[PDB]
Amino acid sequence: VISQVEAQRKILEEAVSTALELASGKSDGAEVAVSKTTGISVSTRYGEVENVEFNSDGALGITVYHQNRKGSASSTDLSPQAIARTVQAALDIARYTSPDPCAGVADKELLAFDAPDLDLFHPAEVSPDEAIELAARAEQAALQADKRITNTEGGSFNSHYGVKVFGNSHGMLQGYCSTRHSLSSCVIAEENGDMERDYAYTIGRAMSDLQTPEWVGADCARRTLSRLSPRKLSTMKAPVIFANEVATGLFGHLVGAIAGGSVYRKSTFLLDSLGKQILPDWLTIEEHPHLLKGLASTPFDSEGVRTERRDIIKDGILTQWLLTSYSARKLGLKSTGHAGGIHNWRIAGQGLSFEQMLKEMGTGLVVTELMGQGVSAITGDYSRGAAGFWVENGEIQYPVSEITIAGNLKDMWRNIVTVGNDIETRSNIQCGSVLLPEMKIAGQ
Amino acid sequence: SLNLVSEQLLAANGLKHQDLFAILGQLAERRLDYGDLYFQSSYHESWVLEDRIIKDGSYNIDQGVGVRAISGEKTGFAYADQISLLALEQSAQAARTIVRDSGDGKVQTLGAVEHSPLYTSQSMSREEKLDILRRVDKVAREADKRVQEVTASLSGVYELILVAATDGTLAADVRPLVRLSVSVLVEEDGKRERGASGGGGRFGYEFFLADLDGEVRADAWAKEAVRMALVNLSAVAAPAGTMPVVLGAGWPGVLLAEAVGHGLEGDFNRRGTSVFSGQVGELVASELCTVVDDGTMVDRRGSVAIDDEGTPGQYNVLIENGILKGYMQDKLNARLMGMTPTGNGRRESYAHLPMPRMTNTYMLPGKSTPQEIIESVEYGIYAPNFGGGQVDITSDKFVFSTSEAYLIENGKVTKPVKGATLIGSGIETMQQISMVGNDLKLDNGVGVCGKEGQSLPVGVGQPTLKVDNLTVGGTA
Amino acid sequence: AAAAA
Ligand code: NA
Ligand code: NA
Ligand SMILES: [Zn+2]
Fold first, then answer.
1. Does the entry annotate any disulfide bonds, and if so which pairs (chain B)?
2. Location of each CATH 3.30.2290.10 domain in chain A
3. A299 to each of A309, A310, B445, how far by Cα in Å?
């Protein structure tokens, strides 16, 4: 694999240099990104091979600038003649677009000319038959757990490696390799004519970081069986715990509300909140772009800008926006290295286990799965479909479904009671379960 | 048409029909029910207006071949971002490893047949395209002094496809698609809101300058985005609980298209994982309800002259007077269920597997007037527009959020209310339909459907209809 | 299983 990848990396570096040189005589600036991803995706049904898919995907994108006018083009063909056609297409577009002084190559002083090695590349030579056996073991372990498991949506295994190279007309040319592997299963249980589905998974940059297939199947069966025979709650007001797996997404809504694109257009409910305490005074959100092997670590953003350790929220206070080159320029600020999103968020627990949080709440709703859109970027209004469990006397009583939870993000974030030590560790944003004092629940 | 596509995808890349025979032969060395070769090339352009200027544009190209080998439940699949003999050979040799056993080699002779044309095969100048966007900006800003921002975009695709299979299928398509999108922001005394409009279909950009009820279409849509934004600016908190809901005609058909339409896709029903599995012949809906999926609609975004397996688009009655009649299929799931292809085998591109998918999904009209429907409600909600949502076809749940909605009080539409999320069961909701209007419409050409990470252009529609009880996720 | 405009 490693010899294949280094051969690909050389071809990609040449593609970037070729595109920049073709652009250089006819534009004031240019940015070029290329990538190649290769691997396998397999599934099983009742432990037998179902699908075997061989993946091989390439891409080249260019943006050019002249008189502050911009134009872009892309191709999946990386031959020199296809590159030439792509460059000419972008140049032709920039003849007709209007001058816009916030557009252009990122500032030279912010570029990662000498980008750090973040150890994201851990290849495996997994054969299709080996892949199928991992997926089959996970699915079989789930199916064997309980006689109420009467159907399946299968086992799945994925393993891929990638190479990415970025260059621009300030002279940056840097690239890096990465890997991702995952294993999952999803089964169906039934009780009294009512069917429910759930899943479990493991993910990592190295194969030796994954949970076992038997762990995955056990977790899948546990989750699926816990959903059986739910109740539809009556309409009420009650306390709500966002379980860890959905609490990460609750903090996730911050990203859209502090993104520079929404801030300069005045299309965010947090427009007037920079420097304000929007979360509890004990709560800090840490961004860590340079964690070794990190799931969302990156040595530079999609515009080649350096990524930095930052506390986005510090003691409850909003400390900065999430900016790109264009949105920074609209605001009179500098890029914060957020072109392409956020880069590992961490929120510490305040001491309690999930069990201790149930005891503190006493009576209320735990949400474990959320559905739909239902979140307004401009107002903060929140209304989402939910499934989970009803809690009384500090103990889970029964599963619930076919209900909504509603509020406004400003009030929800400000009045968080606590965050648990039960940290979800498979995602970009990582935190434990979160307790809120009240939401409006719609049902019967 | 088959000749024209063959010259562009095969002859121009050094391939002949005998190369197709050779590669299908390589697949049929193994014990297979079916194999196919799928060729594609496309070009995509876009232009964007914002801050009263032509801010951006793009030109994107893709091309390639995908190869499948199928035995019973099983599929092997490989592909390449190029069209060449070597890419075909490498892809076939990888895909056929799904089964080790030898086959008899007995394929059916390749032979094309005619199908009905459903859409045409720069048609406008660059400055004329950009003038559509300039016109939208001018009309939106002129409509109300509170309009502060306008983003308008034009998108166009030209796509060629050719499919050849071991069952003798040899077919081609030429697929145009255009879309105009408009978004506006309004401001008053420090309060801001947004509204949107647009659409399109399988034709050129001239559609956007044609007549819509006595005005230029682009002008009408610019004004609609402003109207929507101002309704939202005035809207108050929505009520919470179970109550009657009147769903508007057109795009609000997305709610049942998604919940019931995905429920009736043949892959879920073959596996037994849909709530509709084994229910053919049963009453799954009010007797007032007939639901169709229709791939045959001339010029529509959701239509398929052929699907991605070469099966011509069809008018498929899924539910008729409340009774479940059958399922949407691809070739794989039709064989396993003992049924036949329906024209629903669709794939996002050559780099993805086909599966059963929707085309244009809608409910047929009934006998009530929309006025009669509204007059029947003492207290409830009227919902003429939605954003998006999500469905669970196993436990039978849907979740969809309103984008324009009102209270109904004493049989009249009254106060506008803010985004609310509606939740319910697909079967229970259809059984709660007590009135069906005489005002069928489809969406303007905006639908996008996702399944297993694959996004496709679709249509949705319905008349006005009344759901007697549905949970509304407001705050009040 | 997720649709939008
Ligand atoms: Na230059
Ligand atoms: Na026909
Ligand atoms: Zn869909």
1. none
2. 1-230
3. 12, 15, 41
A54 touches chain B (CB under 8 A): yes
B452 exposure class (CB count in 10 Å sphere: 0-12, 13-18, 19+): exposed
The architecture of the domain spanning A1-230 is: 2-Layer Sandwich (3.30)
Contacts of A57 in chain B (CB under 8 A): 81, 351
C-alpha closest to that of B363 among B450, B291, B459, B423: B291
For B277, the 3-state DSSP assignment is: coil
B72 in helix, strand or coil? coil
- Beta-carbon contacts of residue A280 (< 8 Å; ≥ 6 apart): A316, A414, A416
Q: List all residues 6 or more positions away from A33 whose beta carbon is below 8 Å from its beta carbon.
A: A59, A60, A61, A164, A165, A166, A302
Chain C residue with CA closest to B393: the answer is: C1
Resolution, in Å, please? 1.4
C-alpha of B203 from chain center = 16
Residues of chain C with Cβ-Cβ distance to B393 below 8 Å are 1
Q: Residue ranges of the alpha helices (H) in A234-372?
A: 244-258, 260-264, 325-331, 354-361
> Which amino acid is present at A278?
I
Q: Which residue of C has its CA nearest to B357?
A: C1
DSSP secondary structure, B149-197, as one string: EEEEEEEEEEEEEEEEETTS-EEEEEEEEEEEEEEEEEEETTEEEEEEE
Ligand nearest to the CA of A105: 1
3-state per-residue secondary structure call for A259-290: EHHHHHCCCCCCCCCCCCECCCCCCCEEECCC
